[PDB]
Design a protein around this ligand. Structure first.
Ligand SMILES: *[C@@H]1O[C@H](CO[C@@H]2O[C@@H](C)[C@@H](O)[C@@H](O)[C@@H]2O)[C@@H](O[C@@H]2O[C@H](CO)[C@@H](O)[C@H](O)[C@H]2NC(C)=O)[C@H](O)[C@H]1NC(C)=O
Ligand SMILES: *[C@@H]1O[C@H](CO)[C@@H](O[C@@H]2O[C@H](CO)[C@@H](O)[C@H](O)[C@H]2NC(C)=O)[C@H](O)[C@H]1NC(C)=O
Ligand code: NAG
Ligand code: NAG
Ligand code: NAG
Ligand code: NAG
Ligand code: NAG
Ligand code: ZN
Lengths: 596, 195
């Protein structure tokens, strides 16, 4: 009996013991997220402890079959996913210290409160409060006060924790035969083995840099336009050849520029397309929305929803009887159980979120046949890139006229198209530089390129060079600005958003080519196109069984992340912005500062 | 007239696990096959070697009825010349099979909240199973080179596992009850005959 047969038998036992334990954990978690009761929390915790214990015990057994002995490229993937040690490589005291540091950072971010000067009886938390001031207030001193407060109390309480967090997360990575904790994160994109379809962990940096070197013109033109439209609201605070202050971007950190649509709308007389009043005057409910989404998915060839979906799922707010968590989620409990939790309301936003969650559920239904450890997406960005493209086709005016929610005599003028494109760009295009900046800074900190005493200096030098935003007041080494964000204080990866943004438009262009759509890409609808549904299902059914380089080729035809499809989506806006910025300055200078 | 006892086979209160499946020799009685058309939802009524319509006016010597409970995804493994976990270690049918295979859903009876752990199936066996063979051994499976000596651990597994039936699983994982009819004719006088 060679080693491979023994590995196959061990995997056969694991696949039966894991499904049952995971189902009991998932059902307990669902019951907790529907109700709220001291009993349900206890049941959740007990089941979670059982599942964690089962995984902890089984990894020790799997570290007795050497990896090089197996040549199957499917058993190796499953054993590799079990053989990671994690934080167990460290000593007990160091592990306890790391857990304490993480818990302290989480609990200091969660309950951070800021108090206005000379008034202790009025203090604000993060949500709500400070998030409403920097989303709707047009005063300048009100925004700067909140921006400085959040990084004065909460920001400065995390740097001593963060330094030790870094030094301790480097030891765990180095004990796992990596270079640094940054290389550990880049391991989700590593493919070793199958010839031609190989991806190294260091190639991701080059790919990201190459892709970002092409988005710079469109981002520059958008930045110049927003700068021109922001001088009219703050007359004597913004330089016509300078950089945008960091507290005037509609959010605490500047992640999204959505809340600038009121100030930067191209044509204010013409309103956007809202079908909220149409839905109410036709007497629609949540059930109608979900059946419409299902009917949309069946046209492209994908299957129906299970009979258990319509019975075991929550689609309406229970009311005062129950206390639930109103966060739209898609559940795959295992063993054929699929459910959606969503407090649905009659609004176009919920109409699109229904399509999004149903796309998640369809992707889950596709790979049910694979083994347990290969029941995920190709990588961390495929899943919600697949989910997102379904919402793009559901909001186009062509689709809305077909289902009758929009009048059949409504004509699509060329002035609303610019509105739609700019609204989409303020959310999709305005966050890529921020994502790239933050991930680059975190990667450089872990490697050791940024010394311990030049963190904020390089952080603010990178923002004036990549994103284009300058600080309103000076900051020194006593501050920890990056830790002020949720994804940094809590140990989370951040490049998934970048990869998802670039993947979704590649997928959309491939499907629109398959659907024989002629015209601009942003009017596209893949409805009633059976060919465009087989192509997608040729990728949804694989899961992690094959490298993500091959799964992309089954849809797009290329084997690498590409940016040209994103630019084809924004061509009319790019031309309009080039015409509009003929009498302005495009670019920025890294010398001007508001405090100078 | 004495009708064959097809009532107590299909409509039994409790069924048997796959690895220890019951067999009833129905003999020397007249058999009415219209009774079988009750229980209207049949997930499968595939017949081999005969046709359901003319089954009445062709009569045999001995008829065997075998009963057990499987999951939905494994119903396709009870056809002749199939390969799978159940068809190779639990219940195997010959390639020259004559008879019918009947399966109907039993979610409302065999699934309980919390789980029904009384149904078991074999997962590990040394070699494949010859047709119409029944194994009830519970010896430790040795998957390595180190003798097990009647314990469990590294490369020494427990052969039988248990289903976890619940009333919330999908159609493919819900319980199904299967009854298989085998028709034997031989030079010994024919006894079981229809109307
Ligand atoms: C998707 O197709 C349905 C079905 O319409 C038929 O199939 C199409 C492929 C095409 O060949 C149509 O001409 C066929 O009639 C469309 O539903 C129909 O839409 C028309 C709109 O003119 C309407 O008059 C019918 O009543 C609809 N039939 C129904 C609802 O049963 C649907 O509009 C198509 N969606 C698209 C193109 O986005
Ligand atoms: C996970 O940790 C275990 C031990 O905690 C590692 O197993 C040891 O690996 C070293 C490497 O040479 C051997 O010398 C030891 O004999 C192994 N066993 C023990 C008990 O120490 C294992 O390699 C780690 N996982 C990975 C992927 O490296
Ligand atoms: C969960 O909510 C249901 C709905 O009202 C209720 O009947 C049940 O008692 C709740 N669970 C517990 C443990 O009380
Ligand atoms: C790997 O093992 C699986 C076992 O399910 C087998 O189907 C597959 O063909 C093997 N791969 C190769 C390349 O033979
Ligand atoms: C989906 O369900 C509807 C009604 O339940 C049915 O008419 C349709 O045929 C189903 N689609 C498929 C592919 O079975
Ligand atoms: C829209 O169409 C009109 C019609 O002539 C044209 O003048 C205008 O340049 C077009 N583009 C925009 C952005 O209005
Ligand atoms: C099955 O058995 C039950 C209980 O004895 C009985 O009520 C029912 O009528 C039987 N079904 C048929 C088809 O005879
Ligand atoms: Zn989602």
């Amino acid at each position: 009996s060679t080693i491979e047969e023994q590995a196959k038998t061990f995997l056969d036992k694991f696949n039966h013991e894991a499904e049952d334990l995971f189902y009991q954990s998932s059902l307990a978690s669902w019951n907790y997220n529907t109700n709220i009761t001291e009993e349900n929390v206890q049941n959740m915790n007990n089941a979670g402890d059982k599942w964690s214990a089962f995984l902890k015990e089984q990894s020790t057994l799997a570290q007795m079959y050497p990896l090089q002995e197996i040549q199957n490229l499917t058993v190796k993937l499953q054993l590799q996913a079990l053989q990671q040690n994690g934080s167990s490589v460290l000593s007990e005291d160091k592990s306890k210290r790391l857990n304490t540091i993480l818990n302290t950072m989480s609990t200091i971010y969660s309950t951070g409160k800021v108090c206005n000067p000379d008034n202790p009886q009025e203090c604000l938390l993060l949500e709500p409060g400070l998030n409403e001031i920097m989303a709707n207030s047009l005063d300048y001193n009100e925004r700067l006060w909140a921006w400085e407060s959040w990084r004065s109390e909460v920001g400065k309480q995390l740097r001593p924790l963060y330094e030790e967090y870094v030094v301790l997360k480097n030891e765990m990575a180095r004990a796992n035969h990596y270079e640094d904790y940054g290389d550990y994160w880049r391991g989700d994109y590593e493919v070793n083995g199958v010839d031609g379809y190989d991806y190294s962990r260091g190639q991701l940096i080059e790919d990201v840099e190459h892709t970002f070197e092409e988005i710079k013109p469109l981002y520059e033109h958008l930045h110049a336009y927003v700068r021109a439209k922001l001088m009219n609201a703050y007359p004597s605070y913004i330089s016509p050849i300078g950089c945008l202050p960091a507290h005037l971007l509609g959010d605490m950190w500047g992640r999204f520029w959505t809340n600038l649509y009121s100030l930067t709308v191209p044509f204010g007389q013409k309103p956007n397309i809202d079908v909220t009043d149409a839905m109410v005057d036709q007497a629609w409910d949540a059930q109608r929305i979900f059946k419409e989404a299902e009917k949309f998915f069946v046209s492209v060839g994908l299957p129906n929803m299970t009979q258990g979906f319509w019975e075991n799922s929550m689609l309406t707010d229970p009311g005062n009887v129950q206390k639930a968590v109103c966060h739209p989620t898609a559940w795959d409990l295992g063993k054929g159980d699929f459910r959606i939790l969503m407090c649905t309301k009659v609004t176009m936003d919920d109409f699109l979120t229904a399509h999004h969650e149903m796309g998640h559920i369809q992707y889950d239904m596709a790979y049910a046949a694979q083994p347990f450890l290969l029941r995920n997406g190709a990588n961390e960005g495929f899943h919600e890139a697949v989910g997102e493209i379904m919402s793009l086709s559901a909001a186009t005016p062509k689709h809305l006229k077909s289902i009758g929610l929009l009048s059949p005599d409504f004509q699509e003028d060329n002035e609303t198209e610019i509105n739609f494109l700019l609204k989409q760009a303020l959310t999709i295009v305005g966050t890529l530089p921020f994502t790239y900046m933050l991930e680059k800074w975190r990667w450089m900190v872990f490697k050791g390129e940024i010394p311990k005493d030049q963190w904020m200096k390089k952080w603010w030098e990178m923002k004036r060079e990549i994103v284009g935003v300058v600080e309103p007041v000076p900051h020194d080494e006593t501050y920890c600005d990056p830790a002020s964000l949720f994804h940094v204080s809590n140990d989370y990866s951040f490049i998934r958003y970048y990869t998802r943004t670039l993947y979704q438009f590649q997928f959309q262009e491939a499907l629109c080519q398959a659907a024989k759509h002629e015209g601009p890409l942003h009017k596209c609808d893949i409805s009633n196109s059976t060919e465009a549904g087989q192509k997608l299902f040729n990728m949804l059914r694989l899961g992690k069984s094959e490298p993500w380089t091959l799964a992309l080729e089954n849809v797009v035809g290329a084997k690498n992340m590409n940016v040209r499809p994103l630019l084809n989506y924004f061509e009319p806006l790019f031309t309009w912005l080039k015409d509009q910025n003929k009498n302005s300055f495009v670019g920025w200078s890294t010398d001007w500062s508001p405090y100078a | 007239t004495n009708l064959c006892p097809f009532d107590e086979v299909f409509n039994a209160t409790r069924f048997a696990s796959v690895y220890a499946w019951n067999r009833k020799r129905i003999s020397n009685c007249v058999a009415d096959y219209s009774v079988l058309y009750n229980f209207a939802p049949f997930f499968a009524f595939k017949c081999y070697g005969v046709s359901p319509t003319k089954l009445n006016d062709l009569c045999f010597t001995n008829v065997y009825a075998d009963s057990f409970v499987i999951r939905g995804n494994e119903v396709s493994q009870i056809a002749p010349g199939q390969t799978g976990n159940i068809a190779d270690y639990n219940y195997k049918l010959p390639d020259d099979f004559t008879g019918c295979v009947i399966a109907w859903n039993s979610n409302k009876l065999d699934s309980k909240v919390g789980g029904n752990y009384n149904y078991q199936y074999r997962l590990f066996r040394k070699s494949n199973l010859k047709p119409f063979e029944r194994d009830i051994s519970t010896e430790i499976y040795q998957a390595g080179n180190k003798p097990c000596n009647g314990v469990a651990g590294f490369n020494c597994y427990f052969p039988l596992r248990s289903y976890g039936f619940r009333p919330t699983y999908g159609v493919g994982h819900q319980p199904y009850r299967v009854v298989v009819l085998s028709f034997e004719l031989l030079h010994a006088p024919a006894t079981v005959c229809g109307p």
